[PDB]
Design a protein around this ligand. Structure first.
Ligand SMILES: C[C@@H]1N[C@@H](C#Cc2ccccc2)[C@H](O)[C@@H]1O
Length: 439
């Protein structure tokens, strides 16, 4: 056992109503919008295949020249009420917004830097408009914040001198100022999701990460803080040197997910995954033909996968420079929305069911011990295998959409065949089980 000043604080999972809400929400959308949307992956006539929001890096653009894009920031089609309506219709319960990405341009008019929305043709507080619009739809808002900042020359990648240490100390104060500003300007915020915390400079300054967490929790009652912020005394990130989770939820599953058989450890803490639609594009990229683009069922599979293992999922969108969404993203949101409207009782407010994974799909467990079978892979056998934990029996099965009764046949002690529906649903579908535990 190691002694630590800046390690974990939470015992197990938070069970206050604010965390229960963060959890129960389950499905969110991510918005990556920044100056990178203007060039859209292309610089000086060359299209780069890397993530469009990192184009400054790929094309080696100096900060002064990158930040001049502010002069073209004029999203005339932007309408926050329309954005919120799109998120509502998708069935998202929350949205995570890039308040500032690595480029350093702020979507709110920060008083601590000139690189903000206020100094663009458009002038308006985008972020404030979004907060208000989403909240009006009953949709929680979470703020993405990049610690790394390519616009501020006090940023350091590592501390190699006393000069570096002085500069970086200023940078942290500047960061604290932006954070307090966001918290006090927009007090309905439910979560801060830190990114760009991987450099040695941050790892060496664990104390600050713990401080940022406590500071924001004092300013916003019940606010959530992601693990990715946090580093301990020894520079160990996410989980401290005694294996304990820092922050309120685990936040490392990015464009990947834990294995449903081998990574059951994740059910012991709250966590959230995020994903892109193309292979690796978060900001708007002009050419989606350059990598594989997921279909709606592929996205829905990942969402349900997350919930089945006790985690949330956040699907990313990268709005155009003009403030509208591309057609592929509108189609996706609409498709997800249709399916969630029909089957979302197996997603919202659900969790890990404690059953052995089977090949047909995923189990989720409801708040009143409902066990849902979410079927993505239809067996030619016409039988869905259900192996129960010790002491649990299956009393009934019901097709969720129609209420029709589904035959259940005991095959062995602790195992059943649940029939497929008489008519093939023709899409991923849900069978609800009634289970009983021995007494
Ligand atoms: C949520 C995503 N995190 C950002 C990143 C990254 C990254 C950078 C270097 C190596 C591996 C991952 C992406 O640009 C996006 O914000």
């Amino acid at each position: 056992e190691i002694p630590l000043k800046y390690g974990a604080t939470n015992e197990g999972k938070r069970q206050d109503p604010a965390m229960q809400k963060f959890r129960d929400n389950r499905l969110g959308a991510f918005i990556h919008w920044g100056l990178y949307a203007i060039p859209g992956g292309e610089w000086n006539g060359k299209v780069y295949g890397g993530a469009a929001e990192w184009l400054k890096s790929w094309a080696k653009v100096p900060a002064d020249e990158w930040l001049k894009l502010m002069d073209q920031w004029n999203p005339t089609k932007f309408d926050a009420k329309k954005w919120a309506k799109m998120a509502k219709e998708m069935g998202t319960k929350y949205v995570k917004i890039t308040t500032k990405h690595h480029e350093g341009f702020c979507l709110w008019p920060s008083k601590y830097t000139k690189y903000t929305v206020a100094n663009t043709p458009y002038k308006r507080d985008i972020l404030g408009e979004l907060v208000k619009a989403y909240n009006d739809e009953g949709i929680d808002v979470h703020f993405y914040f990049s610690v790394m900042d390519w616009s501020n020359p006090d940023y350091r990648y590592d501390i190699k001198s006393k000069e570096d240490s002085i500069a970086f100390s200023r940078f942290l104060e500047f960061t604290d100022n932006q954070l307090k500003e966001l918290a006090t300007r927009y007090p309905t915020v439910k979560d801060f999701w830190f990114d760009g915390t991987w450099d040695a400079s941050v790892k060496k300054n664990g104390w600050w990460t713990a401080h940022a967490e406590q500071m924001l929790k004092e300013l916003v009652p019940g606010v959530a803080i992601n693990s990715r912020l946090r580093a301990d005394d020894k520079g160990k990130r996410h989980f401290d040197s005694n294996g304990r989770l820092m922050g309120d939820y685990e936040s490392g599953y990015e464009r990947r997910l834990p294995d449903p058989v081998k990574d059951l450890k994740v059910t012991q803490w709250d966590w959230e995954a995020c994903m892109t639609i193309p292979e690796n594009q978060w900001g708007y990229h002009k050419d989606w033909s350059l990598s594989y683009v997921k279909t709606p069922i592929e996205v829905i599979d990942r969402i349900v996968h997350a919930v089945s293992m006790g985690g949330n999922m956040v699907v990313n969108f990268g709005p155009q420079a003009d403030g509208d969404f591309r057609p592929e993203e509108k189609a996706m949101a609409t498709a997800i929305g249709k399916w969630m409207n029909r089957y979302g009782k197996a997603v919202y407010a659900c969790d890990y069911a404690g059953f052995e994974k089977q090949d047909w799909g995923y189990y989720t467990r409801g708040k009143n011990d409902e066990v849902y079978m979410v079927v993505f892979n239809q067996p030619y056998s016409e039988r869905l295998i259900v192996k129960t934990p010790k002491g649990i029996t299956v009393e009934k099965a019901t097709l969720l959409t129609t209420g029709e009764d589904i035959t259940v046949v005991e095959t062995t002690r602790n195992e059943y065949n649940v029939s497929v529906p008489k008519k093939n649903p023709g899409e991923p579908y849900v069978i609800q089980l009634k289970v009983r535990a021995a007494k």
